[PDB]
Symmetry: C2
Subunit: 129 residues, 2 copies
């Protein structure tokens, strides 16, 4: 089974994401509710997947993503948001960015995409049409 | 059921893509083997999905994508390639919903279509 760390301070989403991962044969190594300890916990526990909520207190979510990549973390990072900011997360080296409002199916799709070598980010047709 | 057009001249991939779409309750409105008629067939048949091989003869496949977006086609366009780590950024900049290598199998094409139905796009990742 793949291993994950959940980095999110929102009670409802924490429970939903934990239940989603366990249903999909992914083990949870740790759950964090702030960003201050995140880079160290990831470096110690060596998860395959890190899910990072954009509004984590302490060290900010995107900063955690940037620092993990800078420090050569090679695993799957999916950014989640309670609600345009996908592009920045893509440029910062996330494997996906998922809005939690549309449910949990998108987080598991993003992890699947990432395992397959693909990224999973919001699409805006208005940029092109 | 959603509808699709397949634009690919490679016999083996045509069959594999068609069987994959069928299996997933997607109807095939047309199958094209060149890019010259592509924009016209798409505008007339009005598919939800267009699958375009990068090596399609005639009008080049990425050009077909660009022209369809210029002409306000609002459906799902997935670019496919027989091979490569590199094409995908350009396909994303041109307005595709995804770019997938056919080498690793059909599962990525249906994942890309499902991503696009959900409002997401599906492109190769490089950590490099």
């Amino acid at each position: 089974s793949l291993n994950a760390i959940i980095i999110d301070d929102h009670p409802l989403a924490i429970a939903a994401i934990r239940n989603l991962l366990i249903k999909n044969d992914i083990e949870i190594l740790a759950e964090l509710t702030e960003g201050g300890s995140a880079v160290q916990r990831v470096e110690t526990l060596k998860p395959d997947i890190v899910i990072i909520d954009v509004d984590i207190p302490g060290v900010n979510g995107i900063q955690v993503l940037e620092t993990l990549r800078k420090r050569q973390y090679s695993g799957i990072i999916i950014i989640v948001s309670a609600k345009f900011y996908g592009k920045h997360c893509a440029d910062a080296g996330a494997n996906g960015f998922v809005s939690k409002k549309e449910g949990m199916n998108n987080i598991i799709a993003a992890i699947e995409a990432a395992k397959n070598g693909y990224c999973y980010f919001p699409f805006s047709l208005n940029r092109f049409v």
